[PDB]
Amino acid sequence: NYMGNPWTEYMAKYDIEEVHGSGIRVDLGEDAEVAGTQYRLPSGKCPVFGKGIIIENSNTTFLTPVATGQYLKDGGFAFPPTEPLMSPMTLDEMRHFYKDNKYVKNLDELTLCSRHAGNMIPDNDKNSNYKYPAVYDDKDKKCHILYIAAQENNGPRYCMFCFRPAKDISFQNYTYLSKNVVDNWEKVCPRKNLQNAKFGLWVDGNCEDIPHVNEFPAIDLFECNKLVFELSASDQPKQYEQHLTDYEKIKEGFKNKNASMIKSAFLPTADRYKSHGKGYNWGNYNTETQKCEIFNVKPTCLINNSSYIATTALSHPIEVE
């Protein structure tokens, strides 16, 4: 049994630590200075298909522009109107806008949205490396730049916004994009779920079952993908204090308050809250028994099993191939 693992090249895109390298549920894998203070920001190299933000106890949608001039509770997370308008921007508008840039004009729509978002200067700071994240909506072909990079805020006494990341049927055409999304993501990142296939581990010439999985009821692929997402790699502080302090806000990915930057004397001037993509990122869904089998070790082969669909936290929650 001294031939190799024949699955190595095919399974590269499922090594999430390597190809994505950051949180998935909450991505805050880098820090970047703006006006003297280090802020956390998304840095995953792969698109996160189907991810959006749910605002608790409100009628506001998260792609609504932030409240300006408007009560805070009536606004979302998206860029406020700029002149000329930079967000939202359609795919056609983006390609026209970048007509004279050979290196950007013909990027795929997801990478283009990421790059477009990355051209927005934060807080008139000419030399900051901070770059806002974005959400691309594949139905309307619209790129939405996010002004708020925070993705979860729901401590006991934290809520003015209560919110959390989730996959929801309403978000199925959305993709969450960090500043770092690679231009060849289609080749090196997951997207489609693998029908009639089961993730496994290559041992001694056969694909064997993942040794340790956690099993949950799930009515379909979508709910399994949702469960994997909820348990996946997260850069959120696994710690909520008694009150939402400025230090905690920075730890959650906030940058601005009303008319000023958020600062804290407690900011150490690391790597305490970075998953670097480690987590329960993978699932095998049994379509015959309605069980979602979730695990936290990278798979290194596929098992030919017609009862299964293989999924990841990054993957689209519906699409199969």
Task: Write up what this structure looks like.
It is classed as cell invasion. The chain is of the alpha+beta class and 321 residues long. Helices cover 14% and strands 25% of the residues. It has helices at residues 8-11, 16-19, 91-97, 109-117, 185-188, 221-231, 246-252, and strands at 30-34, 37-41, 48-49, 51-55, 89-90, 134-137, 142-145, 163-167, 174-177, 194-203, 206-209, 214-217, 256-257, 260-261, 282-286, 291-295, 301-312. β6 and β7 (142-145) form a beta hairpin. It starts with 7 loop residues before the first helix and ends in a 9-residue tail after the last strand.
Count of all domains:
3
DSSP strand count: 17
- Tally of contiguous helical segments: 7
Specify the overall morphology: globular
Element order: H for helix, E for strand:
HHEEEEEHHEEEEHEEEHHEEEEE
Give the DSSP E fraction (strand runs of 2 or more residues). 15-25%
Report the C-alpha radius of gyration, rounded.
Answer: 20 Å
Strand neighbour order, sheet with most strands? 11-10-17-15-16-12
**Based on helices, strands and strand pairing, what is the structural class?**
alpha+beta
Helix content: 10-25%
Q: Measure the end-to-end span.
A: 31 Å
**Main β sheet profile:** 6 strands, antiparallel
